[PDB]
Design a protein around this nucleic acid. Structure first.
Ligand SMILES: [Mg+2]
Ligand SMILES: [Mg+2]
Ligand SMILES: [Mg+2]
Ligand SMILES: [Mg+2]
Ligand SMILES: [Mg+2]
Ligand SMILES: [Mg+2]
Ligand SMILES: [Mg+2]
Ligand SMILES: [Mg+2]
Ligand SMILES: [Mg+2]
Ligand SMILES: [Mg+2]
Ligand SMILES: [Mg+2]
Ligand SMILES: [Mg+2]
Ligand SMILES: [Mg+2]
Ligand SMILES: [Mg+2]
Ligand SMILES: [Mg+2]
Ligand SMILES: [Mg+2]
Ligand SMILES: [Mg+2]
Ligand SMILES: [Mg+2]
Ligand SMILES: [Mg+2]
Ligand SMILES: [Mg+2]
Ligand SMILES: [Mg+2]
Ligand SMILES: [Mg+2]
Ligand SMILES: [Mg+2]
Ligand SMILES: [Mg+2]
Ligand SMILES: [Mg+2]
Ligand SMILES: [Mg+2]
Ligand SMILES: [Mg+2]
Ligand SMILES: [Mg+2]
Ligand SMILES: [Mg+2]
Ligand SMILES: [Mg+2]
Ligand SMILES: [Mg+2]
Ligand SMILES: [Mg+2]
Ligand SMILES: [Mg+2]
Ligand SMILES: [Mg+2]
Ligand SMILES: [Mg+2]
Ligand SMILES: [Mg+2]
Ligand SMILES: [Mg+2]
Ligand SMILES: [Mg+2]
Ligand SMILES: [Mg+2]
Ligand SMILES: [Zn+2]
Lengths: 50, 119, 52, 71, 100, 86
RNA sequence: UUGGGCCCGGCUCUUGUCUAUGUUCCUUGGAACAGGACGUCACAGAGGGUGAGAAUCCCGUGCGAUGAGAUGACCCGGGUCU
RNA sequence: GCGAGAGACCGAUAGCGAACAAGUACAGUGAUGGAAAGAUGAAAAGAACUUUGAAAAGAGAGUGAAAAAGUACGUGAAAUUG
RNA sequence: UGCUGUAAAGCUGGGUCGAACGGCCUCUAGUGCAGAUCUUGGUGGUAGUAGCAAAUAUUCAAAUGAGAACUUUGAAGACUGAAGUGGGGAAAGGUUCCAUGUCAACAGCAGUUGGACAUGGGUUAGUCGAUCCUAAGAGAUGGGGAAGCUCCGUUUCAACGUGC
RNA sequence: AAACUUUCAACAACGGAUCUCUUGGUUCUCGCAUCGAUGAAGAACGCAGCGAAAUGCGAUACGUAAUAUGAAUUGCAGAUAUUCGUGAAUCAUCGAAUCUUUGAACGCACAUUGCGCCCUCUGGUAUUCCGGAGGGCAUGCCUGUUUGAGCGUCGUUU
C-alpha cells in the first residue's frame, strides 16, 4: 500500500536493485560461467513474501 | 597509490586532521565530476587515503592511552588482552602455582630422584 | 555409503486410489521434486539396496 | 533536478539516510557557506535520501551550482 | 520360525544395535601411537626406568592359588624391613601399597 | 464456497518479518517467531528437524569472528606487533 | 635430605630459505609429452602442470642444511645472583 | 570444530540434497518442504568480408587438425520423425 | 561384411570417432531386466483433432510501418447510464507509474501495441496520516509454582518517585 | 498405377543414452583443543571506475595498518601509481585497527528507523526551550564503599 513502514520500503528497495540484467562486461572475463542473471523476479509472477 | 603511511606517522594531530579535511573535499569534488565523466578511477585512491589518515589518527591516539595506563591496575577493556573469554577466566600463573605450606614442605622433602639401575 | 543417504526426505505414500504406484512420494509443492518417488532402491535419489 | 536550481532557487542533493533536516541545513552552511530557507527531504525508491534545499533570496542557487561545479 | 534339528540360538540383536557398533579399524594406528607415546615417555626421563618396581603376590581364589603374579605395591612392613620410607620409596622407582 | 471463493479473502497476514532471523515467521498476535522462537533468549531448534538445523547454524553466515580464532590460536594468541627484520 | 630469580642452550610446536640428471637426432602429428637411437641422474622412477602416456621441460619428490618466531611453576643441561 | 594423509569406495538418474551464483531457485500463513543443472577447441583462432532478406537467418567466404567441434558446442544410442 | 558357438555370446569388414583399452591365471562385488497402476528422463498415436461460442458492435479513411481485422489520429455507429464500464481510497501488491527505445519469449489469433523487454526519470508536509491515548486484550517486575522448557499473577502478603 | 500404410537401409532430425573424464562426494586413519557481555553464532541493509549473484568487507565498507615478498592486475579503463625500490600485486602472513542496523542484546519500546533521562562541549539574545557532537543509564548474583531503616537490640542521660 501507499502507507508502508520504513522496514517494508527498505526491503522493496533492495528487491528492485537485485532485479537487473547481467552486466555484459562480466561475460568477457576469463573462465566466466555466468551467462545471465538466474535470479530475476517479475512482480506479477513471483511474490516477495514480505 | 596515494599517501605514504610512514610519512603520516611523523605528523601531529593538527596536521593529520588538516590533511583529512583536504582529502574529503577532494573526494567531494570527484563525486561532482563523476556525474559527467562518469568513469573516474581516481576516486579509489582518495578513498583509501582517507582510510589511511583515519587509521594513523586512531593508532596514534591509542598508544597515548596505552602510555597513560601503562602499569595501572585497571585499564580500558579494549586495551586488555583479547585471547578468548575462557582464557581470561583461567587462573593466572601466580594463582595456578599457589601451594599450601603443607604441600610445599612435602614437595621439598621428597623431590623426584634421578637414578639408574644395574650398577 | 552415508548412513542417511536416500533418507533425508519426509516422503509419504499417497496410498492407492490415485492411479500411481504405492511408492512413497515427496510432499509439498512449487518444486519439480514434489510428488516424486523416494526411499526406494528402484527410485532415483533413494538409498541403494542393502547399503554397504 | 536542474529545473529547480534555476526556477525555484533550490539545490538538490543526495544525502545520508541517517541525517535529518537540522543536520542538512548545517552541512550546506559549513560546506558551501549558504543559508537554506528550508530543507525538504525524501527517501527514494532505490533507498537513498534526496534533499530539496531552497536557499534564501540572499543566494542565487545557479551561482552556487557553478561553484560546486555540476552546471 | 522353529524348523529342523538345529541348536536353539540366543542372538541378542533386537535393540538398535547398529547405532553402537565399534569396529577397531584403528588397531594398528593405536599400536603405533602407543609405541610413540612410550618412546617419548622413556626419552623424557632417561636413564631413569619407565616402570616402578612391583611386588610379587599370590593370585586370589582356589583356582589361582598356584599362580603368583605382580602386585600393585610393596607393603609398609616390607619397605620397613629394608629401611625405606614409603614417601621416599615412591621417589626412587618403588611402588607402595598401604592396603596390602 | 470453501475453495476458490474463500481463497479470495486472504489479505490479513498472520506472520510478519522477524527481527532476529528476518524470515516472515513472526506471529503478529502471538508476538513470537515460529522459526527462531524470538523473543525467547534461546534459539528454537529441535532434534526431530535435523534439516532445519542445517539451514541456520554456524557456517551458514559470515562467521566474522570465529573465522580467525584458529589463526589466532595457532600463533599462541599473540599480543604485540611483528618486528621488522634488520 | 633441602630455597628462589634471570641467561644461554637442548627438547616440543609453527614457519622462512636453499638442492641431481636431455628438452640431443630421426619418423608421425596442429602440438611429442608417441615410436625408434644414443644417453644422464637416482637416498629423487610419489604426485601435478605443460598443445597426447614426461624421472631427466617446470613445480615438486628424496637427502639434508641453515634462519626466524613461539612455548614449558608443574621438561633437563649448564651457567649466574641471592 | 580445526589441520592432514589415505582407499580393491561412487563416477553426474551414481556419490552428500547440493561436483555448477545449493540449502540456491521455487512452494507453503506457518512449522517446514526443496530441485534441476558438469564436458567447443591446445588456443576464441567465437566466423573479417561479399551477397539475398524488414529482420532472424541463409548462401558464398574465413579460422581451425577437425565446423562429421559454431556456444541450440566432445561422442551423439533408442523411442519418435522428414 | 561376414565367421565361430546348441546357447549365453566372442571375433571380424566398412562408416563414424578422438584417449585410452584388452587377452589369459586368479581375487572381489552395489554384477545381467520386459513387466513391479516400478523410478527419473525423453517421445508417440490420438491430432492439425476437442476446441479458441457469456458480458448488444462494429465500420470507413488517413498516418506509421517490410508487414495493419487488432497501433495512432479523424469520421461515424454503439454501450456502461451516477447502486457506472465514472472519480477516489482501506487491505494486498511493489515500480506494475512516466518518457524513450523496443518485439526473441509472454499477451492460448495477431501485433508496429502492452501491466512484456531495455535504458533512464519520478514520491518534497510544523497543519494529511503514523507517531500519542486507551478498548477487548497482550505482558515484564515483586512474588508463588514447576526437574525444567516455563506457568500464574498485573499491584498482586513489595521499604516500588531514574518525584515535582 | 499413384497416393496412403508397414518394414529396411543411407543421410538429416528429435533426444541425451553410451564411452572417456572429475578443483565433488563417501568411508577409514593420524594430529590438535580454540565461540560469546573485551558482545558470539545468526539476521537485515549497504560497500567496487564500470556488478545482478557467489565470495569478501562495514560509512576507514571486494577493504585500513603491520610483517613478508618482490613486478604485477587484466573484461575494459585509469592514475595527482609503481621498477637496482619504504616497492606493483598478494585474506602470502597477520600481532594493530575499523567493524552500519541488529542479535544472549543491555535506557524504555519495537508490525514504529517511536519515546526518554544524565554529563561535557557547542549553535540559536538561555541552569529551564530548540538544534548538533561526544560519553552514559538493563537484570540476577559476589566482594567492598557510602548513605540509611527497624523499641531486633547494647551502653549513657533525664
Ligand atoms: Mg495474483
Ligand atoms: Mg543417492
Ligand atoms: Mg517527508
Ligand atoms: Mg532361552
Ligand atoms: Mg630441482
Ligand atoms: Mg598430459
Ligand atoms: Mg621419446
Ligand atoms: Mg609428468
Ligand atoms: Mg577422497
Ligand atoms: Mg546428484
Ligand atoms: Mg539430487
Ligand atoms: Mg555434454
Ligand atoms: Mg541487407
Ligand atoms: Mg573429429
Ligand atoms: Mg567433434
Ligand atoms: Mg554435438
Ligand atoms: Mg531411429
Ligand atoms: Mg573401422
Ligand atoms: Mg575406434
Ligand atoms: Mg581429448
Ligand atoms: Mg591386465
Ligand atoms: Mg543391483
Ligand atoms: Mg526397460
Ligand atoms: Mg513417465
Ligand atoms: Mg502426445
Ligand atoms: Mg476444429
Ligand atoms: Mg465452449
Ligand atoms: Mg479509432
Ligand atoms: Mg444505454
Ligand atoms: Mg505504462
Ligand atoms: Mg499469441
Ligand atoms: Mg507472434
Ligand atoms: Mg519490466
Ligand atoms: Mg493531524
Ligand atoms: Mg513523533
Ligand atoms: Mg486492561
Ligand atoms: Mg520473578
Ligand atoms: Mg559416463
Ligand atoms: Mg504502534
Ligand atoms: Zn525469527
Amino acid at each position: 500500500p501507499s502507507q508502508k513502514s520504513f522496514r517494508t520500503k527498505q526491503k522493496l528497495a533492495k528487491a528492485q536493485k537485485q532485479n537487473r540484467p547481467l552486466p555484459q562486461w562480466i561475460r568477457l572475463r576469463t573462465d566466466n560461467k555466468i551467462r545471465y542473471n538466474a535470479k530475476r523476479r517479475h512482480w506479477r509472477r513471483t511474490k516477495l513474501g514480505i | 597509490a596515494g599517501v605514504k603511511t610512514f610519512e603520516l606517522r611523523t605528523k601531529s594531530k593538527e596536521q593529520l586532521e588538516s590533511q583529512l579535511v583536504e582529502l574529503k573535499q577532494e573526494l567531494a569534488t570527484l563525486k561532482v565530476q563523476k556525474l559527467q565523466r562518469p568513469s573516474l578511477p581516481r576516486i579509489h585512491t582518495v578513498r583509501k587515503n582517507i582510510a589511511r589518515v583515519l587509521t594513523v589518527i586512531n593508532l596514534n591516539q591509542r598508544e597515548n592511552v596505552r602510555a597513560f595506563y601503562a602499569g595501572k591496575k585497571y585499564i580500558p577493556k579494549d586495551l586488555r588482552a583479547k585471547k578468548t573469554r575462557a582464557l581470561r577466566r583461567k587462573l593466572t600463573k601466580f594463582e595456578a602455582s599457589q601451594e599450601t605450606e603443607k604441600a610445599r614442605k612435602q614437595r621439598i622433602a621428597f623431590p623426584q630422584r634421578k637414578f639408574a639401575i644395574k650398577a | 555409503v552415508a548412513e542417511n543417504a536416500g533418507h533425508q526426505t519426509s516422503a509419504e505414500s499417497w496410498g492407492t486410489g490415485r492411479a500411481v504406484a504405492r511408492i512413497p512420494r515427496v510432499g509439498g509443492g512449487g518444486t519439480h521434486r514434489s510428488g516424486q518417488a523416494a526411499f526406494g532402491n528402484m527410485c532415483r535419489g533413494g538409498r541403494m539396496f542393502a547399503p554397504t | 533536478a536542474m529545473k529547480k536550481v534555476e526556477d525555484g532557487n533550490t539545490l538538490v542533493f543526495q544525502v545520508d539516510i541517517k541525517s535529518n533536516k537540522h543536520q542538512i541545513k548545517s552541512a550546506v552552511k559549513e560546506l558551501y557557506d549558504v543559508d537554506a530557507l528550508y530543507v525538504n527531504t525524501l527517501i527514494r525508491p532505490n533507498g537513498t535520501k534526496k534533499a530539496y534545499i531552497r536557499l534564501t533570496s540572499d543566494y542565487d542557487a545557479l551561482d552556487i551550482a557553478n561553484r560546486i561545479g555540476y552546471i | 520360525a522353529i524348523s529342523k534339528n538345529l541348536p536353539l540360538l540366543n542372538n541378542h540383536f533386537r535393540k538398535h544395535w547398529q547405532e553402537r557398533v565399534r569396529v577397531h579399524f584403528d588397531q594398528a594406528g593405536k599400536k603405533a601411537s602407543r609405541r610413540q607415546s612410550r618412546l617419548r615417555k622413556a626419552a623424557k626421563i632417561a636413564p631413569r626406568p619407565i616402570d616402578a618396581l612391583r611386588p610379587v603376590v599370590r593370585a586370589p581364589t582356589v583356582k589361582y592359588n598356584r599362580k603368583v603374579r605382580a602386585g600393585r605395591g610393596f607393603t609398609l612392613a616390607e619397605l620397613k624391613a629394608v629401611g625405606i620410607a614409603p614417601k621416599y620409596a615412591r621417589t626412587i622407582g618403588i611402588s607402595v601399597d598401604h592396603r596390602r | 464456497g470453501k475453495g476458490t471463493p474463500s481463497l479470495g479473502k486472504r489479505h490479513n497476514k498472520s506472520h510478519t518479518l522477524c527481527n532476529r532471523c528476518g524470515r516472515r515467521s513472526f506471529h503478529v498476535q502471538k508476538k513470537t517467531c515460529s522459526s527462531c522462537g524470538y523473543p525467547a533468549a534461546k534459539m528454537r531448534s529441535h532434534n526431530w528437524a535435523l534439516k532445519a538445523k542445517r539451514r541456520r547454524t554456524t557456517g551458514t553466515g559470515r562467521m566474522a569472528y570465529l573465522k580467525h580464532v584458529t589463526r589466532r590460536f595457532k600463533n599462541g594468541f599473540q599480543t604485540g606487533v611483528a618486528k621488522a627484520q634488520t
